Symmetry: C2
Protein backbone atom coordinates (compact mmCIF):
# COMPACT_ATOMS: atom_id res chain seq x y z
CA UNK A 1 0.00 0.00 0.00
CA UNK A 2 1.29 3.42 -1.04
CA UNK A 3 -0.61 5.22 1.73
CA UNK A 4 0.63 2.81 4.40
CA UNK A 5 2.67 4.53 7.13
CA UNK A 6 6.12 5.87 6.24
CA UNK A 7 9.00 6.00 8.68
CA UNK A 8 11.67 8.68 8.56
CA UNK A 9 14.96 8.71 10.42
CA UNK A 10 17.93 11.01 10.79
CA UNK A 11 19.93 13.28 13.04
CA UNK A 12 18.26 16.46 14.29
CA UNK A 13 21.73 17.71 15.23
CA UNK A 14 25.41 16.80 14.89
CA UNK A 15 27.34 17.72 18.03
CA UNK A 16 30.71 18.17 16.29
CA UNK A 17 29.19 20.55 13.74
CA UNK A 18 29.53 24.25 14.55
CA UNK A 19 26.60 26.26 13.12
CA UNK A 20 26.87 29.70 11.55
CA UNK A 21 23.98 31.16 13.57
CA UNK A 22 24.38 31.03 17.36
CA UNK A 23 20.62 30.44 17.43
CA UNK A 24 21.21 26.92 16.08
CA UNK A 25 23.58 25.74 18.82
CA UNK A 26 22.49 22.50 20.46
CA UNK A 27 25.06 21.06 22.94
CA UNK A 28 24.92 17.42 24.02
CA UNK A 29 24.20 18.09 27.71
CA UNK A 30 21.32 20.38 26.76
CA UNK A 31 19.83 17.53 24.71
CA UNK A 32 20.42 14.78 27.27
CA UNK A 33 18.96 17.02 29.97
CA UNK A 34 15.63 17.71 28.28
CA UNK A 35 15.56 14.09 27.10
CA UNK A 36 4.72 12.37 21.37
CA UNK A 37 6.19 15.36 19.53
CA UNK A 38 4.28 16.23 16.37
CA UNK A 39 5.89 15.76 12.97
CA UNK A 40 4.93 18.57 10.57
CA UNK A 41 5.85 19.97 7.16
CA UNK A 42 8.34 22.86 7.25
CA UNK A 43 7.22 24.09 10.69
CA UNK A 44 3.63 24.71 9.65
CA UNK A 45 1.54 23.47 12.57
CA UNK A 46 -1.43 23.31 10.23
CA UNK A 47 0.56 20.58 8.48
CA UNK A 48 1.08 17.82 11.05
CA UNK A 49 1.59 14.52 9.24
CA UNK A 50 2.48 12.22 12.12
CA UNK A 51 4.60 12.00 15.26
CA UNK A 52 8.12 11.41 16.52
CA UNK A 53 8.27 7.72 17.47
CA UNK A 54 11.77 7.70 19.00
CA UNK A 55 14.63 9.98 20.01
CA UNK A 56 18.07 8.92 21.20
CA UNK A 57 21.14 10.95 22.07
CA UNK A 58 24.03 9.02 20.55
CA UNK A 59 27.79 9.54 20.17
CA UNK A 60 27.54 11.91 17.19
CA UNK A 61 24.29 13.66 18.00
CA UNK A 62 20.55 13.47 18.46
CA UNK A 63 18.93 10.78 16.33
CA UNK A 64 15.21 10.70 15.68
CA UNK A 65 12.73 8.32 14.08
CA UNK A 66 9.36 9.68 13.04
CA UNK A 67 6.23 8.08 11.66
CA UNK A 68 4.23 9.68 8.85
CA UNK A 69 0.66 8.49 9.34
CA UNK A 70 -1.80 11.14 8.12
CA UNK A 71 -4.14 9.60 5.48
CA UNK A 72 -4.93 13.04 4.05
CA UNK A 73 -1.21 13.85 3.63
CA UNK A 74 -0.26 10.41 2.33
CA UNK A 75 -3.04 10.56 -0.28
CA UNK A 76 -1.89 13.98 -1.52
CA UNK A 77 1.64 12.60 -1.77
CA UNK A 78 0.47 9.46 -3.57
CA UNK A 79 -1.31 11.52 -6.22
CA UNK A 80 1.57 13.96 -6.65
CA UNK A 81 4.07 11.09 -6.85
CA UNK A 82 2.29 9.78 -9.96
CA UNK A 83 3.17 13.00 -11.80
CA UNK A 84 6.86 13.12 -10.93
CA UNK A 85 9.54 12.23 -13.46
CA UNK A 86 12.00 11.86 -10.59
CA UNK A 87 9.74 9.28 -8.95
CA UNK A 88 9.06 7.54 -12.27
CA UNK A 89 12.80 7.03 -12.70
CA UNK A 90 12.78 4.88 -9.57
CA UNK A 91 15.47 3.97 -6.98
CA UNK A 92 19.00 2.66 -7.47
CA UNK A 93 19.86 -0.90 -8.55
CA UNK A 94 18.29 -3.22 -5.95
CA UNK A 95 15.77 -1.17 -3.93
CA UNK A 96 12.10 -1.71 -4.71
CA UNK A 97 10.35 1.29 -6.29
CA UNK A 98 8.07 3.06 -3.79
CA UNK A 99 6.48 6.23 -5.21
CA UNK A 100 5.23 7.72 -1.93
CA UNK A 101 8.54 7.11 -0.16
CA UNK A 102 10.58 8.39 -3.08
CA UNK A 103 8.49 11.55 -3.40
CA UNK A 104 8.90 12.25 0.30
CA UNK A 105 12.64 11.56 -0.03
CA UNK A 106 12.91 14.08 -2.85
CA UNK A 107 10.69 16.79 -1.39
CA UNK A 108 11.61 16.75 2.29
CA UNK A 109 15.21 15.61 2.31
CA UNK A 110 15.94 17.24 5.66
CA UNK A 111 14.85 17.38 9.30
CA UNK A 112 14.51 20.34 11.64
CA UNK A 113 13.95 20.34 15.39
CA UNK A 114 11.74 23.28 16.40
CA UNK A 115 10.26 20.99 26.53
CA UNK A 116 10.83 20.57 22.79
CA UNK A 117 8.14 21.50 20.25
CA UNK A 118 8.12 19.39 17.08
CA UNK A 119 10.21 17.96 14.26
CA UNK A 120 9.63 19.38 10.81
CA UNK A 121 10.22 17.61 7.53
CA UNK A 122 11.77 20.22 5.22
CA UNK A 123 13.50 20.47 1.84
CA UNK A 124 16.79 20.87 3.72
CA UNK A 125 17.69 21.52 7.35
CA UNK A 126 19.39 24.63 8.69
CA UNK A 127 21.59 22.40 10.86
CA UNK A 128 24.08 20.28 8.90
CA UNK A 129 23.93 16.48 8.97
CA UNK A 130 20.12 16.47 9.19
CA UNK A 131 19.42 14.26 6.14
CA UNK A 132 15.98 12.59 6.23
CA UNK A 133 15.91 8.88 5.40
CA UNK A 134 12.49 7.42 4.54
CA UNK A 135 11.45 3.78 4.47
CA UNK A 136 8.60 1.40 5.25
CA UNK A 137 10.49 -0.50 7.97
CA UNK A 138 11.87 1.48 10.95
CA UNK A 139 14.52 -1.18 11.55
CA UNK A 140 15.70 -0.80 7.95
CA UNK A 141 15.63 2.98 8.30
CA UNK A 142 17.92 2.99 11.36
CA UNK A 143 20.25 0.52 9.65
CA UNK A 144 21.02 3.09 6.93
CA UNK A 145 23.16 5.07 9.39
CA UNK A 146 26.69 3.59 9.90
CA UNK A 147 27.22 5.67 13.05
CA UNK A 148 24.49 3.96 15.08
CA UNK A 149 25.44 0.96 17.21
CA UNK A 150 23.33 -2.11 17.99
CA UNK A 151 22.85 -0.65 21.46
CA UNK A 152 21.83 2.64 19.86
CA UNK A 153 19.23 0.80 17.79
CA UNK A 154 18.04 -1.15 20.85
CA UNK A 155 17.15 2.09 22.62
CA UNK A 156 15.36 3.41 19.54
CA UNK A 157 13.53 0.14 18.86
CA UNK A 158 12.05 0.08 22.36
CA UNK A 159 10.65 3.53 21.66
CA UNK A 160 8.97 2.95 18.30
CA UNK A 161 7.67 -0.54 19.17
CA UNK A 162 -8.70 12.58 13.85
CA UNK A 163 -6.40 13.38 10.92
CA UNK A 164 -3.92 16.00 12.21
CA UNK A 165 -3.04 17.31 8.74
CA UNK A 166 -4.93 20.58 8.35
CA UNK A 167 -3.35 21.66 5.07
CA UNK A 168 -3.72 20.80 1.38
CA UNK A 169 -1.90 20.19 -1.89
CA UNK A 170 -1.93 23.96 -2.53
CA UNK A 171 -0.03 24.52 0.70
CA UNK A 172 2.61 21.94 -0.20
CA UNK A 173 2.91 23.45 -3.69
CA UNK A 174 3.44 26.92 -2.25
CA UNK A 175 6.13 25.48 0.02
CA UNK A 176 7.73 23.76 -3.00
CA UNK A 177 8.54 27.08 -4.68
CA UNK A 178 10.20 28.42 -1.54
CA UNK A 179 12.45 25.36 -1.60
CA UNK A 180 13.66 26.27 -5.09
CA UNK A 181 15.23 29.43 -3.70
CA UNK A 182 17.06 28.09 -0.62
CA UNK A 183 20.67 28.86 -1.40
CA UNK A 184 23.04 25.90 -1.76
CA UNK A 185 20.27 23.38 -1.07
CA UNK A 186 21.82 20.51 -3.00
CA UNK A 187 25.38 21.23 -1.83
CA UNK A 188 24.12 21.27 1.77
CA UNK A 189 22.21 18.02 1.26
CA UNK A 190 25.25 16.28 -0.27
CA UNK A 191 27.41 17.52 2.60
CA UNK A 192 24.86 16.01 5.00
CA UNK A 193 24.89 12.69 3.11
CA UNK A 194 28.67 12.55 3.50
CA UNK A 195 28.59 13.44 7.20
CA UNK A 196 26.11 10.70 8.13
CA UNK A 197 27.48 8.12 5.70
CA UNK A 198 24.22 7.53 3.84
CA UNK A 199 24.32 6.87 0.09
CA UNK A 200 21.69 6.85 -2.67
CA UNK A 201 23.09 3.40 -3.45
CA UNK A 202 21.45 1.85 -0.38
CA UNK A 203 18.53 4.20 0.30
CA UNK A 204 15.85 6.28 -1.41
CA UNK A 205 17.83 9.51 -0.86
CA UNK A 206 17.60 11.62 -4.02
CA UNK A 207 20.28 14.23 -3.37
CA UNK B 1 -12.77 41.75 -6.24
CA UNK B 2 -9.16 41.45 -5.08
CA UNK B 3 -8.80 37.72 -5.75
CA UNK B 4 -10.25 38.69 -9.12
CA UNK B 5 -7.20 40.65 -10.20
CA UNK B 6 -5.15 37.59 -9.23
CA UNK B 7 -6.86 35.32 -11.75
CA UNK B 8 -6.77 37.85 -14.60
CA UNK B 9 -4.58 36.84 -17.58
CA UNK B 10 -0.81 36.71 -17.16
CA UNK B 11 1.53 37.45 -20.04
CA UNK B 12 4.96 35.91 -20.28
CA UNK B 13 7.83 36.76 -22.56
CA UNK B 14 11.40 35.77 -23.20
CA UNK B 15 13.78 34.26 -25.70
CA UNK B 16 13.21 30.66 -26.75
CA UNK B 17 16.74 30.62 -28.17
CA UNK B 18 19.78 32.92 -28.32
CA UNK B 19 21.66 33.07 -31.63
CA UNK B 20 24.74 34.15 -29.68
CA UNK B 21 24.73 31.02 -27.51
CA UNK B 22 26.51 27.86 -28.66
CA UNK B 23 24.78 24.84 -27.06
CA UNK B 24 26.86 21.85 -25.95
CA UNK B 25 24.16 19.50 -27.23
CA UNK B 26 23.38 19.32 -30.93
CA UNK B 27 19.68 18.65 -30.35
CA UNK B 28 19.36 22.17 -28.92
CA UNK B 29 20.79 23.90 -32.00
CA UNK B 30 18.38 26.43 -33.50
CA UNK B 31 20.09 28.72 -36.08
CA UNK B 32 18.59 32.00 -37.28
CA UNK B 33 18.24 30.86 -40.89
CA UNK B 34 16.26 27.84 -39.69
CA UNK B 35 13.99 29.84 -37.39
CA UNK B 36 13.20 32.30 -40.20
CA UNK B 37 12.35 29.53 -42.67
CA UNK B 38 9.98 27.76 -40.27
CA UNK B 39 8.60 31.08 -39.04
CA UNK B 40 -3.08 28.82 -35.31
CA UNK B 41 -1.61 30.05 -32.03
CA UNK B 42 0.72 27.52 -30.43
CA UNK B 43 -0.33 26.13 -27.06
CA UNK B 44 1.42 27.17 -23.87
CA UNK B 45 1.85 24.30 -21.41
CA UNK B 46 3.64 23.36 -18.22
CA UNK B 47 6.85 21.47 -18.87
CA UNK B 48 5.74 19.92 -22.18
CA UNK B 49 2.82 18.13 -20.55
CA UNK B 50 -0.14 17.99 -22.98
CA UNK B 51 -2.56 17.70 -20.07
CA UNK B 52 -1.18 20.96 -18.68
CA UNK B 53 -2.09 23.55 -21.33
CA UNK B 54 -2.50 26.94 -19.63
CA UNK B 55 -2.75 29.33 -22.56
CA UNK B 56 -1.37 30.22 -25.97
CA UNK B 57 1.56 31.89 -27.69
CA UNK B 58 0.52 35.42 -28.74
CA UNK B 59 3.63 36.29 -30.71
CA UNK B 60 6.92 34.91 -32.00
CA UNK B 61 9.65 36.93 -33.65
CA UNK B 62 13.19 36.39 -34.83
CA UNK B 63 15.20 39.41 -33.73
CA UNK B 64 18.90 40.24 -33.80
CA UNK B 65 19.81 38.23 -30.71
CA UNK B 66 17.41 35.31 -31.04
CA UNK B 67 13.86 34.00 -31.17
CA UNK B 68 11.58 35.96 -28.86
CA UNK B 69 8.07 34.96 -27.94
CA UNK B 70 5.18 36.32 -25.96
CA UNK B 71 2.63 34.02 -24.38
CA UNK B 72 -0.64 34.53 -22.53
CA UNK B 73 -1.66 32.39 -19.56
CA UNK B 74 -5.46 32.22 -19.54
CA UNK B 75 -6.58 28.96 -17.88
CA UNK B 76 -8.96 29.72 -14.98
CA UNK B 77 -8.23 26.39 -13.27
CA UNK B 78 -4.44 26.79 -13.52
CA UNK B 79 -4.63 30.42 -12.38
CA UNK B 80 -6.80 29.47 -9.38
CA UNK B 81 -4.41 26.66 -8.40
CA UNK B 82 -1.50 29.09 -8.63
CA UNK B 83 -3.39 31.71 -6.63
CA UNK B 84 -4.06 29.27 -3.78
CA UNK B 85 -0.48 28.01 -3.68
CA UNK B 86 0.89 31.58 -3.80
CA UNK B 87 -0.86 32.37 -0.50
CA UNK B 88 1.26 29.68 1.11
CA UNK B 89 4.63 30.82 -0.21
CA UNK B 90 7.15 32.60 2.03
CA UNK B 91 8.93 33.74 -1.12
CA UNK B 92 5.74 35.33 -2.43
CA UNK B 93 5.01 36.85 0.99
CA UNK B 94 8.35 38.67 0.91
CA UNK B 95 7.06 40.43 -2.20
CA UNK B 96 8.71 42.01 -5.28
CA UNK B 97 11.38 44.68 -5.59
CA UNK B 98 10.01 47.93 -4.17
CA UNK B 99 8.22 49.97 -6.86
CA UNK B 100 6.40 46.92 -8.23
CA UNK B 101 2.97 46.20 -6.82
CA UNK B 102 2.82 42.83 -5.06
CA UNK B 103 1.18 40.29 -7.39
CA UNK B 104 1.00 36.84 -5.80
CA UNK B 105 0.11 34.87 -8.94
CA UNK B 106 2.74 36.61 -11.11
CA UNK B 107 5.35 36.17 -8.39
CA UNK B 108 4.53 32.48 -7.92
CA UNK B 109 4.82 31.90 -11.68
CA UNK B 110 8.05 33.91 -11.82
CA UNK B 111 9.49 31.75 -9.06
CA UNK B 112 8.25 28.34 -10.18
CA UNK B 113 8.42 28.47 -13.99
CA UNK B 114 11.38 30.82 -14.50
CA UNK B 115 12.31 29.37 -17.87
CA UNK B 116 10.94 28.98 -21.37
CA UNK B 117 11.33 25.87 -23.54
CA UNK B 118 10.42 25.52 -27.22
CA UNK B 119 8.86 22.26 -28.38
CA UNK B 120 10.55 21.99 -31.80
CA UNK B 121 4.04 22.71 -38.42
CA UNK B 122 7.69 22.95 -37.26
CA UNK B 123 6.75 24.86 -34.09
CA UNK B 124 4.55 22.72 -31.84
CA UNK B 125 4.33 24.53 -28.48
CA UNK B 126 6.07 26.55 -25.80
CA UNK B 127 6.55 25.19 -22.32
CA UNK B 128 6.93 27.11 -19.10
CA UNK B 129 9.54 25.26 -17.05
CA UNK B 130 11.67 25.67 -13.91
CA UNK B 131 14.64 26.54 -16.09
CA UNK B 132 15.30 26.12 -19.80
CA UNK B 133 17.88 23.82 -21.33
CA UNK B 134 18.85 26.56 -23.80
CA UNK B 135 20.64 29.44 -22.10
CA UNK B 136 19.09 32.90 -22.02
CA UNK B 137 15.55 31.47 -21.92
CA UNK B 138 14.46 33.40 -18.83
CA UNK B 139 10.68 33.77 -18.54
CA UNK B 140 9.36 37.24 -17.69
CA UNK B 141 5.82 37.45 -16.32
CA UNK B 142 3.58 40.51 -16.20
CA UNK B 143 -0.02 41.69 -16.56
CA UNK B 144 0.69 43.89 -19.61
CA UNK B 145 2.25 42.63 -22.90
CA UNK B 146 3.94 46.00 -23.46
CA UNK B 147 5.47 46.06 -19.99
CA UNK B 148 6.79 42.53 -20.46
CA UNK B 149 8.48 43.26 -23.80
CA UNK B 150 9.97 46.41 -22.25
CA UNK B 151 11.87 44.29 -19.70
CA UNK B 152 14.24 43.17 -22.46
CA UNK B 153 16.95 45.78 -23.33
CA UNK B 154 17.93 43.97 -26.54
CA UNK B 155 14.57 44.60 -28.20
CA UNK B 156 14.36 47.77 -30.28
CA UNK B 157 11.30 49.96 -30.77
CA UNK B 158 10.90 48.30 -34.18
CA UNK B 159 11.16 44.85 -32.63
CA UNK B 160 8.35 45.74 -30.21
CA UNK B 161 6.15 47.07 -33.02
CA UNK B 162 6.35 43.69 -34.75
CA UNK B 163 5.47 41.78 -31.60
CA UNK B 164 2.65 44.21 -30.79
CA UNK B 165 1.05 43.82 -34.21
CA UNK B 166 1.05 40.11 -33.39
CA UNK B 167 -0.57 40.07 -29.95
CA UNK B 168 -3.05 42.90 -30.56
CA UNK B 169 -4.03 40.88 -33.62
CA UNK B 170 -4.27 37.75 -31.50
CA UNK B 171 -7.92 37.71 -30.46
CA UNK B 172 -9.53 34.43 -29.42
CA UNK B 173 -7.52 31.30 -30.21
CA UNK B 174 -8.21 27.63 -30.97
CA UNK B 175 -6.18 26.36 -28.01
CA UNK B 176 -8.41 28.32 -25.66
CA UNK B 177 -11.39 27.33 -27.80
CA UNK B 178 -14.74 27.03 -26.04
CA UNK B 179 -13.29 26.25 -22.63
CA UNK B 180 -10.42 25.78 -20.19
CA UNK B 181 -7.59 23.94 -21.98
CA UNK B 182 -6.04 22.77 -18.69
CA UNK B 183 -6.57 19.06 -17.99
CA UNK B 184 -4.38 18.70 -14.90
CA UNK B 185 -4.49 19.71 -11.23
CA UNK B 186 -2.55 20.82 -8.14
CA UNK B 187 -1.25 17.27 -7.64
CA UNK B 188 0.20 17.30 -11.13
CA UNK B 189 1.97 20.58 -10.45
CA UNK B 190 3.15 19.34 -7.06
CA UNK B 191 4.69 16.24 -8.61
CA UNK B 192 6.46 18.39 -11.19
CA UNK B 193 7.84 20.64 -8.41
CA UNK B 194 9.87 17.85 -6.80
CA UNK B 195 11.51 17.26 -10.17
CA UNK B 196 12.58 20.89 -10.34
CA UNK B 197 14.42 20.59 -7.01
CA UNK B 198 16.98 18.24 -8.53
CA UNK B 199 17.87 20.13 -11.69
CA UNK B 200 21.59 20.85 -11.40
CA UNK B 201 22.85 24.45 -11.29
CA UNK B 202 19.28 25.75 -11.56
CA UNK B 203 19.93 29.09 -9.85
CA UNK B 204 23.33 29.75 -11.46
CA UNK B 205 21.78 29.02 -14.88
CA UNK B 206 18.84 31.30 -14.12
CA UNK B 207 21.21 34.03 -12.88
CA UNK B 208 23.29 33.64 -16.04
CA UNK B 209 20.18 33.90 -18.21
CA UNK B 210 18.98 37.04 -16.40
CA UNK B 211 22.29 38.82 -17.03
CA UNK B 212 22.53 37.60 -20.62
CA UNK B 213 19.18 39.15 -21.52
CA UNK B 214 19.61 42.32 -19.46
CA UNK B 215 16.57 41.77 -17.25
CA UNK B 216 18.97 42.36 -14.36
CA UNK B 217 18.63 46.09 -15.09
CA UNK B 218 13.17 45.81 -12.62
CA UNK B 219 10.72 42.92 -12.79
CA UNK B 220 9.12 40.06 -10.91
CA UNK B 221 12.03 37.69 -11.60
CA UNK B 222 12.94 35.87 -8.39
CA UNK B 223 16.38 34.51 -9.31
Amino acid sequence: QAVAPVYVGGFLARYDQSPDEAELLLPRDVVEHWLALPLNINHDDTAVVGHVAAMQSVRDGLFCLGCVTSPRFLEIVRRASEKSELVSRGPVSPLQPDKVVEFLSGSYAGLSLAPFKAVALCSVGRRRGTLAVYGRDPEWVTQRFPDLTAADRDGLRAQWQGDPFRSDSYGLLGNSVDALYIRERLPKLRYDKQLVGVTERESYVKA
